[PDB]
Amino acid sequence: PALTEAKHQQQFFQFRLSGQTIEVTSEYLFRHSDNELLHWMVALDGKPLASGEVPLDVAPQGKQLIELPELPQPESAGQLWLTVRVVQPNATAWSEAGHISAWQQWRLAENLSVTLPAASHAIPHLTTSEMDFCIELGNKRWQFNRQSGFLSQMWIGDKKQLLTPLRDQFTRAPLDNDIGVSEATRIDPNAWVERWKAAGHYQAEAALLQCTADTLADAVLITTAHAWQHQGKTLFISRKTYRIDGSGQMAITVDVEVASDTPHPARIGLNCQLAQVAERVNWLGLGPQENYPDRLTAACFDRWDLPLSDMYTPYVFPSENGLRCGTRELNYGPHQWRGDFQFNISRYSQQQLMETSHRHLLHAEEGTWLNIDGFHMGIGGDDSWSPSVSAEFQLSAGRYHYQLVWCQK
Amino acid sequence: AALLQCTADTLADAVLITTAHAWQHQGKTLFISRKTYRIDGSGQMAITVDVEVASDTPHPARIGLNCQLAQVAERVNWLGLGPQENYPDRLTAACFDRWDLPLSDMYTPYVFPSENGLRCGTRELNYGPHQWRGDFQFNISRYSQQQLMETSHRHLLHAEEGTWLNIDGFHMGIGGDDSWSPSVSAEFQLSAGRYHYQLVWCQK
């Protein structure tokens, strides 16, 4: 996937946007834009509202101004984005016709949603037990284990939906960069992995601090608090609220605290093993390829739909992969998630990935593994034998917050 | 501001209030503020704020709350960055400790008046019988921002009725590379789009 970032960063054309004008600059020293078409287009949350085509005429090292026709001013809520692409109409000795040589995108506007969810004719029905809490609403049912404090299962009809409970996750299956040259025999104490390990990140134990349920006028409310500890030290604290309304949506809210003296964690999110397994993956966010915090300029914000298989990156030596950031809506099966996060989805648990040395040895697991991150550390790469992730990409804030919405169709 | 919603609910151990407002202007919605107030049997009020900012509006100077307290005290005591006025892009010299000063010291008599006296990275703030807790920045004086904003010389300010208090979850940098162009660096602009903060208020 990296190749793409490269291609993008190396493009020969550079754009500037000013009002309705696009400024184009040529990084060619000798040629003229003689096989160049500029396609542009506007969309609202993925919905295309206008497209255009304009032939480029730029001298090496020159500028070209591009005047935009009056732009649409949708009422509807959402993000308005502009995207340009450069195309090579005619083939070349090294390229096919219709080749894309450059692109760039901008966010034009935003229409914040001020609407309210219409009333529901009913409200979830809570049900205590010793072991748990039961929330029911129609065919839908959710259960939270009282000992663990997690959402243990959920049904649609008589169908269980998870093979694994929904939980906080703070680590990742180490990247090559996370490892560097650390070896079992000869460990490198500064490697991220090494530190994480030593800190017990990989093996901290969660502890329920609190778990409560409450009935509100329009929904049911659950609250939890856990602590991950290791050898007496508390690494993290996770406080959540789950709120299920009469519309059948579950809103999740997460607030985490990280000990300042622990190594910044690879990530901050949740995960679970879904019982279902589908064909496609559809999302509204950065795509379509794998992208990370410190490697995503080449990605575009749009609506993507791919086959599950494509959501996996077959790095010969396996590790965390396939992430997509800046996601607002994710759809898989009957499920839908909403918010602002990054995620990955495949048939391999991080543990598997982490424990397997060659790609050829992985075997798909039972359902679908899903990781939803509120935040994720950068990947680095300045070199692969020292820590190369820049500070701006480390999860060093100490406190993190994120929210999410889960539903079915 | 426009009330979008306001509700109350009784929980087993506390009372819960929730609100949602929208600030608009000429049909455009600039911000959205969603809160929860939760008062328990211990008499503490926990506040939770989540804001959304239109990506196409100019980054706001700050994100917080304010009010005019009826009381007026002598000292100010806090646990955070001090003791002098400090801002996001101007605070390396400040220290994290417990500070106690006289109200007067919480004001910066810039000849030409403006926002001032802020202290960041605060975890606990005490004034009178009150106490606030969380992670914020604040300022406290006898002058409303409006006054400051409307007065050209320091000598013309007059203390207002009680004590004005501004508690910020976030605050923009002040800049200074030059004073005749925008000099605040990007790292100091409130450009995230979404902000969250929490607070705790009580009395002694």
Side-chain angles (χ1 to χ4, degrees):
Chain A
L3 190 60
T4 313
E5 190 78 345
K7 169 163 172 188
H8 177 50
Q9 281 309 304
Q10 299 180 346
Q11 45 195 50
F12 287 94
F13 296 96
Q14 311 283 316
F15 310 96
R16 259 206 16 246
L17 177 51
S18 200
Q20 287 233 336
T21 332
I22 299 170
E23 177 195 82
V24 197
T25 297
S26 178
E27 296 192 326
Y28 279 115
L29 305 183
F30 310 116
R31 65 162 222 116
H32 183 95
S33 43
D34 71 27
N35 184 17
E36 272 89 15
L37 218 9
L38 170 101
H39 186 183
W40 63 260
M41 89 123 322
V42 185
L44 184 46
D45 288 349
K47 312 100 107 189
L49 314 199
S51 346
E53 223 140 283
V54 174
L56 285 193
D57 208 44
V58 238
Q61 319 222 264
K63 277 175 200 217
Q64 174 183 357
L65 285 195
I66 303 196
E67 254 324 270
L68 278 193
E70 233 241 325
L71 305 174
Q73 255 84 70
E75 279 305 73
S76 347
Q79 269 161 11
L80 197 52
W81 294 83
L82 172 50
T83 303
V84 308
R85 263 141 60 261
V86 184
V87 208
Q88 291 175 7
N90 315 110
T92 73
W94 48 278
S95 71
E96 299 268 57
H99 175 70
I100 297 336
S101 58
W103 64 96
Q104 169 79 40
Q105 120 201 122
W106 300 259
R107 190 187 14 218
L108 300 183
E110 204 170 18
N111 279 327
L112 288 198
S113 186
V114 287
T115 71
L116 321 107
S120 18
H121 309 335
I123 92 165
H125 170 217
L126 176 48
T127 300
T128 305
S129 142
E130 232 172 76
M131 308 297 80
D132 47 57
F133 291 141
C134 269
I135 319 341
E136 201 154 12
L137 197 95
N139 39 349
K140 290 145 189 195
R141 222 160 351 125
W142 292 264
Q143 143 193 337
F144 289 80
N145 169 288
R146 292 171 87 223
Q147 288 80 86
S148 78
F150 297 109
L151 165 63
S152 317
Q153 175 62 256
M154 101 148 268
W155 291 258
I156 300 152
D158 43 332
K159 284 123 147 144
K160 295 153 137 221
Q161 306 298 298
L162 321 164
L163 307 141
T164 244
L166 186 51
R167 30 163 180 36
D168 295 74
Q169 180 186 227
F170 302 104
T171 62
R172 82 191 172 194
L175 315 187
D176 262 315
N177 291 339
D178 290 339
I179 293 153
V181 302
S182 202
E183 245 139 274
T185 109
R186 220 195 340 78
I187 252 128
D188 173 18
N190 330 283
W192 273 106
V193 81
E194 278 322 330
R195 329 219 258 117
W196 280 334
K197 272 206 206 142
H201 285 200
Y202 283 105
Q203 64 189 204
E205 283 293 44
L208 200 357
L209 285 196
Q210 127 174 349
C211 159
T212 85
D214 267 296
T215 313
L216 277 42
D218 7 50
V220 186
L221 191 62
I222 304 319
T223 96
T224 62
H226 301 68
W228 284 250
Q229 325 168 96
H230 182 263
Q231 294 181 341
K233 169 132 194 153
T234 312
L235 317 197
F236 327 118
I237 296 193
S238 174
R239 296 185 169 98
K240 319 179 204 45
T241 73
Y242 309 75
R243 149 174 205 306
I244 307 199
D245 63 15
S247 72
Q249 318 189 317
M250 195 192 180
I252 314 194
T253 264
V254 194
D255 299 277
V256 183
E257 279 191 81
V258 179
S260 88
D261 58 336
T262 182
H264 314 325
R267 74 156 104 225
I268 300 193
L270 298 173
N271 82 332
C272 70
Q273 190 180 181
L274 299 180
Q276 153 114 47
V277 162
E279 223 78 84
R280 296 226 127 232
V281 187
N282 169 292
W283 78 103
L284 182 71
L286 291 186
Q289 3 76 44
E290 178 183 82
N291 56 82
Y292 289 76
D294 54 336
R295 194 188 78 231
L296 54 69
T297 72
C300 291
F301 178 84
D302 204 298
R303 188 135 225 143
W304 313 98
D305 193 271
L306 303 186
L308 190 57
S309 51
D310 290 358
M311 320 288 297
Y312 159 78
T313 308
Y315 286 122
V316 162
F317 162 96
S319 76
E320 143 77 44
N321 63 97
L323 198 72
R324 334 266 136 137
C325 315
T327 300
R328 296 220 110 188
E329 177 184 319
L330 171 58
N331 297 317
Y332 186 63
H335 295 102
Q336 165 143 126
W337 304 254
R338 285 192 300 211
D340 204 308
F341 48 91
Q342 19 284 336
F343 72 98
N344 72 36
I345 189 167
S346 71
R347 323 261 333 247
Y348 318 88
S349 76
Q350 294 274 298
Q351 178 189 351
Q352 202 198 151
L353 294 173
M354 186 177 184
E355 294 173 339
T356 311
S357 66
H358 294 61
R359 66 185 190 171
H360 77 305
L361 317 193
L362 309 153
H363 68 266
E365 310 185 31
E366 226 197 309
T368 308
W369 278 107
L370 172 66
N371 303 287
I372 302 213
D373 287 344
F375 310 88
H376 201 285
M377 160 163 166
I379 69 187
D382 286 350
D383 64 68
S384 305
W385 43 96
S386 61
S388 52
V389 178
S390 56
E392 331 94 81
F393 301 101
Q394 310 181 19
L395 306 183
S396 61
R399 296 158 359 250
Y400 298 79
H401 174 86
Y402 67 107
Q403 322 168 182
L404 236 206
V405 177
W406 191 345
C407 2
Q408 302 81 1
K409 321 151 248 185
Chain B
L3 200 357
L4 285 196
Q5 127 174 349
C6 159
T7 85
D9 267 296
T10 313
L11 277 43
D13 7 50
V15 186
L16 191 62
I17 304 319
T18 96
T19 62
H21 301 68
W23 284 250
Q24 325 168 95
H25 182 263
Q26 294 181 341
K28 169 132 194 153
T29 311
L30 317 197
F31 327 118
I32 296 193
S33 174
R34 296 185 169 98
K35 319 179 204 45
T36 73
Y37 309 75
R38 149 174 205 306
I39 307 199
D40 63 15
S42 72
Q44 318 189 317
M45 195 192 180
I47 314 194
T48 264
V49 194
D50 299 277
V51 183
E52 279 191 81
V53 179
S55 88
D56 58 336
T57 182
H59 314 324
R62 74 156 104 225
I63 300 193
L65 298 173
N66 82 332
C67 70
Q68 190 180 182
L69 299 180
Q71 153 114 47
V72 162
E74 223 78 84
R75 296 226 127 232
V76 187
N77 169 292
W78 78 103
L79 182 71
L81 291 186
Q84 3 76 44
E85 178 183 82
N86 56 82
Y87 289 76
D89 54 336
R90 194 188 78 231
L91 54 69
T92 72
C95 291
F96 179 84
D97 204 298
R98 188 135 225 143
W99 313 98
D100 193 271
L101 303 186
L103 190 57
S104 51
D105 290 358
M106 320 288 297
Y107 160 78
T108 307
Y110 286 122
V111 162
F112 162 96
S114 76
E115 143 77 44
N116 63 97
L118 198 72
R119 334 266 136 137
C120 315
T122 300
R123 296 220 110 188
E124 177 184 319
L125 171 58
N126 297 317
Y127 186 63
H130 295 102
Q131 165 143 126
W132 304 254
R133 285 192 300 211
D135 204 308
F136 48 91
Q137 19 284 336
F138 72 98
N139 72 36
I140 189 167
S141 71
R142 323 261 333 247
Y143 318 88
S144 76
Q145 294 274 298
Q146 178 189 351
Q147 202 198 151
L148 294 173
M149 186 177 184
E150 294 173 339
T151 311
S152 66
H153 294 61
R154 65 185 190 171
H155 77 305
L156 317 193
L157 309 153
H158 68 266
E160 310 185 31
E161 226 197 309
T163 308
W164 278 107
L165 172 66
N166 303 287
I167 302 213
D168 287 344
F170 310 88
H171 201 285
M172 160 163 166
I174 69 187
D177 286 350
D178 64 68
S179 305
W180 43 96
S181 61
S183 52
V184 178
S185 56
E187 331 94 81
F188 301 101
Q189 310 181 19
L190 306 183
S191 61
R194 296 158 359 250
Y195 298 79
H196 174 86
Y197 67 107
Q198 322 168 182
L199 236 206
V200 177
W201 191 345
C202 2
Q203 302 81 1
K204 321 151 248 185

PDB file of all heavy atoms in Angstrom, chain B residues 58-63 168 170-173 190:
ATOM      1  N   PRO B  58     -14.259  29.874  11.245  1.00  0.00           N
ATOM      2  CA  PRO B  58     -12.933  30.163  11.739  1.00  0.00           C
ATOM      3  C   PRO B  58     -12.734  29.569  13.099  1.00  0.00           C
ATOM      4  O   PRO B  58     -13.639  29.586  13.923  1.00  0.00           O
ATOM      5  CB  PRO B  58     -12.865  31.675  11.862  1.00  0.00           C
ATOM      6  CG  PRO B  58     -14.093  32.242  11.163  1.00  0.00           C
ATOM      7  CD  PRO B  58     -14.930  31.069  10.700  1.00  0.00           C
ATOM      8  N   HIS B  59     -11.565  29.021  13.333  1.00  0.00           N
ATOM      9  CA  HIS B  59     -11.347  28.453  14.631  1.00  0.00           C
ATOM     10  C   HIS B  59     -11.548  29.492  15.678  1.00  0.00           C
ATOM     11  O   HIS B  59     -11.045  30.593  15.615  1.00  0.00           O
ATOM     12  CB  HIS B  59      -9.965  27.854  14.781  1.00  0.00           C
ATOM     13  CG  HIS B  59      -9.695  27.047  13.574  1.00  0.00           C
ATOM     14  ND1 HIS B  59     -10.715  26.346  12.963  1.00  0.00           N
ATOM     15  CD2 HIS B  59      -8.560  26.850  12.867  1.00  0.00           C
ATOM     16  CE1 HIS B  59     -10.173  25.728  11.914  1.00  0.00           C
ATOM     17  NE2 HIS B  59      -8.885  26.011  11.830  1.00  0.00           N
ATOM     18  N   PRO B  60     -12.312  29.089  16.633  1.00  0.00           N
ATOM     19  CA  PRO B  60     -12.709  29.876  17.766  1.00  0.00           C
ATOM     20  C   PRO B  60     -11.570  30.075  18.722  1.00  0.00           C
ATOM     21  O   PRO B  60     -10.721  29.211  18.868  1.00  0.00           O
ATOM     22  CB  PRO B  60     -13.736  29.013  18.476  1.00  0.00           C
ATOM     23  CG  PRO B  60     -13.656  27.624  17.874  1.00  0.00           C
ATOM     24  CD  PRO B  60     -12.699  27.673  16.713  1.00  0.00           C
ATOM     25  N   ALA B  61     -11.613  31.215  19.376  1.00  0.00           N
ATOM     26  CA  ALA B  61     -10.620  31.634  20.342  1.00  0.00           C
ATOM     27  C   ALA B  61     -10.525  30.685  21.495  1.00  0.00           C
ATOM     28  O   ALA B  61      -9.456  30.484  22.094  1.00  0.00           O
ATOM     29  CB  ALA B  61     -11.024  32.980  20.916  1.00  0.00           C
ATOM     30  N   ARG B  62     -11.680  30.138  21.821  1.00  0.00           N
ATOM     31  CA  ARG B  62     -11.707  29.259  22.958  1.00  0.00           C
ATOM     32  C   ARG B  62     -12.981  28.464  23.032  1.00  0.00           C
ATOM     33  O   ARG B  62     -13.949  28.748  22.318  1.00  0.00           O
ATOM     34  CB  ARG B  62     -11.599  30.093  24.223  1.00  0.00           C
ATOM     35  CG  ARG B  62     -12.912  30.817  24.506  1.00  0.00           C
ATOM     36  CD  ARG B  62     -13.046  31.163  25.971  1.00  0.00           C
ATOM     37  NE  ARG B  62     -12.775  32.578  26.126  1.00  0.00           N
ATOM     38  CZ  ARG B  62     -12.015  33.128  27.069  1.00  0.00           C
ATOM     39  NH1 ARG B  62     -11.398  32.442  28.018  1.00  0.00           N
ATOM     40  NH2 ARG B  62     -11.880  34.434  27.063  1.00  0.00           N
ATOM     41  N   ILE B  63     -12.948  27.500  23.951  1.00  0.00           N
ATOM     42  CA  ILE B  63     -14.056  26.591  24.211  1.00  0.00           C
ATOM     43  C   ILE B  63     -14.190  26.325  25.688  1.00  0.00           C
ATOM     44  O   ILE B  63     -13.370  25.592  26.286  1.00  0.00           O
ATOM     45  CB  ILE B  63     -13.831  25.285  23.497  1.00  0.00           C
ATOM     46  CG1 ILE B  63     -13.750  25.582  22.014  1.00  0.00           C
ATOM     47  CG2 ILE B  63     -15.022  24.390  23.738  1.00  0.00           C
ATOM     48  CD1 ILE B  63     -13.834  24.317  21.182  1.00  0.00           C
ATOM     49  N   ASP B 168     -12.049  27.306  30.630  1.00  0.00           N
ATOM     50  CA  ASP B 168     -11.854  26.804  29.314  1.00  0.00           C
ATOM     51  C   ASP B 168     -11.350  25.385  29.249  1.00  0.00           C
ATOM     52  O   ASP B 168     -10.384  24.984  29.943  1.00  0.00           O
ATOM     53  CB  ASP B 168     -10.876  27.735  28.602  1.00  0.00           C
ATOM     54  CG  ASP B 168     -11.564  29.023  28.261  1.00  0.00           C
ATOM     55  OD1 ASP B 168     -12.776  29.156  28.269  1.00  0.00           O
ATOM     56  OD2 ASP B 168     -10.746  29.994  27.972  1.00  0.00           O
ATOM     57  N   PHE B 170     -10.501  24.493  26.276  1.00  0.00           N
ATOM     58  CA  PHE B 170      -9.462  24.760  25.320  1.00  0.00           C
ATOM     59  C   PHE B 170      -9.398  26.202  24.996  1.00  0.00           C
ATOM     60  O   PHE B 170     -10.424  26.886  24.960  1.00  0.00           O
ATOM     61  CB  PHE B 170      -9.731  24.063  24.000  1.00  0.00           C
ATOM     62  CG  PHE B 170     -10.054  22.629  24.222  1.00  0.00           C
ATOM     63  CD1 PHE B 170     -11.368  22.219  24.458  1.00  0.00           C
ATOM     64  CD2 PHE B 170      -9.038  21.675  24.250  1.00  0.00           C
ATOM     65  CE1 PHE B 170     -11.674  20.873  24.667  1.00  0.00           C
ATOM     66  CE2 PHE B 170      -9.330  20.328  24.460  1.00  0.00           C
ATOM     67  CZ  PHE B 170     -10.649  19.927  24.669  1.00  0.00           C
ATOM     68  N   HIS B 171      -8.187  26.626  24.675  1.00  0.00           N
ATOM     69  CA  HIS B 171      -7.976  27.992  24.349  1.00  0.00           C
ATOM     70  C   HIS B 171      -6.920  28.174  23.295  1.00  0.00           C
ATOM     71  O   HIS B 171      -5.853  27.609  23.383  1.00  0.00           O
ATOM     72  CB  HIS B 171      -7.546  28.689  25.636  1.00  0.00           C
ATOM     73  CG  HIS B 171      -7.774  30.151  25.592  1.00  0.00           C
ATOM     74  ND1 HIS B 171      -6.943  30.981  24.860  1.00  0.00           N
ATOM     75  CD2 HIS B 171      -8.727  30.898  26.171  1.00  0.00           C
ATOM     76  CE1 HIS B 171      -7.400  32.217  25.012  1.00  0.00           C
ATOM     77  NE2 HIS B 171      -8.468  32.192  25.798  1.00  0.00           N
ATOM     78  N   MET B 172      -7.205  29.016  22.323  1.00  0.00           N
ATOM     79  CA  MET B 172      -6.280  29.283  21.230  1.00  0.00           C
ATOM     80  C   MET B 172      -4.983  29.942  21.660  1.00  0.00           C
ATOM     81  O   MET B 172      -4.909  30.563  22.698  1.00  0.00           O
ATOM     82  CB  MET B 172      -7.004  30.147  20.219  1.00  0.00           C
ATOM     83  CG  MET B 172      -6.121  30.900  19.276  1.00  0.00           C
ATOM     84  SD  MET B 172      -7.181  31.413  17.914  1.00  0.00           S
ATOM     85  CE  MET B 172      -6.204  32.654  17.052  1.00  0.00           C
ATOM     86  N   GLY B 173      -3.939  29.807  20.864  1.00  0.00           N
ATOM     87  CA  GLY B 173      -2.680  30.427  21.229  1.00  0.00           C
ATOM     88  C   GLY B 173      -2.784  31.940  21.078  1.00  0.00           C
ATOM     89  O   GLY B 173      -3.793  32.449  20.603  1.00  0.00           O
ATOM     90  N   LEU B 190      -7.641  25.989  17.364  1.00  0.00           N
ATOM     91  CA  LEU B 190      -8.662  25.021  17.757  1.00  0.00           C
ATOM     92  C   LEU B 190      -9.322  24.530  16.497  1.00  0.00           C
ATOM     93  O   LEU B 190     -10.391  24.948  16.095  1.00  0.00           O
ATOM     94  CB  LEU B 190      -9.660  25.634  18.762  1.00  0.00           C
ATOM     95  CG  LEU B 190      -8.945  26.242  19.971  1.00  0.00           C
ATOM     96  CD1 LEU B 190      -9.910  26.782  21.012  1.00  0.00           C
ATOM     97  CD2 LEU B 190      -8.077  25.203  20.635  1.00  0.00           C
TER      98      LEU B 190
END
